[PDB]
């Protein structure tokens, strides 16, 4: 589902790199999705904390962004959150 | 107020760069804020389309993110949407 909506995970600028095969196949139905989605920024937060750009390329006009979300070290589940996020970051490199 | 919640607008990666004086002062009460919020990604889109990373720094552990949202030149308001977004991108450079 994740592959169908956004594409295959890869190293190129036109591709995302987040998600193991379980998250890729299940998507929002993934058991641990709410725990990941809590770090996804709201609309106001996204436009408030990110570096935004307007880039016109041969592929078209794009609204670009870059940023970083600080994880609360005083959160009781801080260690599990890191493991789960690292569990999906660049997991496609380990795909068979 | 955008500045109180998400800091001053600036040229650093640590800093957000989006928002003119009106949007900073009014925030979500800005007249055309919904026209901007529509381009913010959903939780699934954010983690599905963005290139995600993790960094452990002296300031803490950070979930880094970057991506590109294609704007539809087909939308009837495409020109107005581009103008609106460009109005707030890097507007801080012209601040008193």
């Amino acid at each position, epitope marked *: 589902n994740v592959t169908q909506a956004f594409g295959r995970r890869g*190293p*190129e*600028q036109t591709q995302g790199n987040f998600g193991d095969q379980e998250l890729i196949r299940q998507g929002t139905d993934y058991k641990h999705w709410p725990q990941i989605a809590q770090f996804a920024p709201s609309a106001s937060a996204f436009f408030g904390m990110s570096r935004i750009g307007m880039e016109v390329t041969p592929s078209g006009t794009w609204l670009t962004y870059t940023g970083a979300i600080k994880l609360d070290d005083k959160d009781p589940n801080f260690k599990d959150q890191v493991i789960l996020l690292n569990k999906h970051i660049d997991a496609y490199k380990t795909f068979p | 107020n955008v500045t109180q919640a998400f800091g001053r607008r600036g040229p650093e990666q640590t800093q957000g760069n989006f928002g003119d004086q009106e949007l900073i002062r009014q925030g979500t009460d800005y007249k055309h804020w919904p026209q901007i919020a529509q381009f913010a990604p959903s939780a699934s889109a954010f983690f599905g389309m963005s*290139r995600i990373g993790m960094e452990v720094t002296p300031s803490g552990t950070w979930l880094t993110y970057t991506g590109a949202i294609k704007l539809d030149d087909k939308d009837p308001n495409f020109k107005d949407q581009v103008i609106l977004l460009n109005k707030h991108i890097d507007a801080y450079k012209t601040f008193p």
Partner: nanobody
Amino acid sequence: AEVQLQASGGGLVQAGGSLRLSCAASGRTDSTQHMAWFRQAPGKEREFVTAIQWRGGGTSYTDSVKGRFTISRDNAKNTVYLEMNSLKPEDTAVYYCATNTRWTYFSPTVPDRYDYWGQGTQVTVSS
């Protein structure tokens, strides 16, 4: 001249052979946003080959090299590698690595958008 680029890895190989170009960045590498490789064949214009984001690591390629060329960088060191497999006579050219400082998501593909340049490395594919 805040950033210095050191390029190497050129050589002479037969069609189907392999080479690895390297571009090591020194100085204020913190301002680097994109690193790219350009090439110029005899009597032809400078052509974009590949590029990589200095922070996130997203990669870009021109159509003629997709699948055969792979650009990479381990995030901790400031040296980027371009692995060139299945080399063709059309790849014979002088290769140049370059860096820039303006943040963009997509790596620029025109030389004027890059600020720092390395020495040219000659690549020749000979029958």
